[PDB]
Write a protein that binds this ligand. Structure first.
Ligand SMILES: Nc1cccc2c1CCNC2
Length: 150
């Protein structure tokens, strides 16, 4: 009973989280996941500032109100060669990664590893934070508050 949370560097507080390295987070789960990180879904403005500090991914993830990909460099296989905060317009499906925003983070690029999920609650799941450099932190707990998400 195990969940990997793959996390990125923070840029102006904003970071990307993949559950098990595959699109698999609903909009309700995303809010709960950010909450467990003492974080919120970013606003578009917060995401634009993160972008300006060096944040890009090649993954769809929730922000507050939209599903987006932050892009600095044009890449044909990432948001169809767009740059800026690319907004997903048309999709059949409801599950993506998520972005989160932690106000207490440094103001620019923070590529130190994440070594806690400070606000997870008591639960049965072995949750493992996986950093991009492979550093891991695990704890037993839960973050999902919606039965539909479990
Ligand atoms: N950020 C991160 C950490 C561990 C694994 C993976 C990522 C993002 C890209 N997908 C794998």
């Amino acid at each position: 009973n195990q969940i990997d949370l793959n996390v990125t560097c923070r840029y102006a507080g904003v970071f990307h989280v993949e559950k098990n390295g595959r699109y698999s987070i609903s909009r309700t789960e995303a809010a709960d996941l950010c909450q467990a990180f003492n974080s919120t879904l970013p606003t578009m403005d917060q995401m634009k500032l993160a972008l300006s500090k060096g944040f890009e991914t090649c993954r769809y993830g929730f922000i507050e109100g939209n599903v987006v990909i932050p892009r600095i460099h044009p890449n044909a296989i990432c948001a169809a060669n767009h740059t800026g905060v690319y907004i997903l317009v048309t999709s059949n499906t409801s599950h993506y990664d998520t972005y989160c925003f932690n106000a207490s983070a440094p103001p620019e690029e923070d590529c130190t590893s994440v070594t806690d999920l400070p606000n997870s609650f008591d639960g049965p799941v072995t949750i493992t934070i996986v950093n991009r450099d492979g550093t891991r932190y695990s704890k037993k707990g839960e973050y999902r508050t919606h039965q539909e998400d479990i």
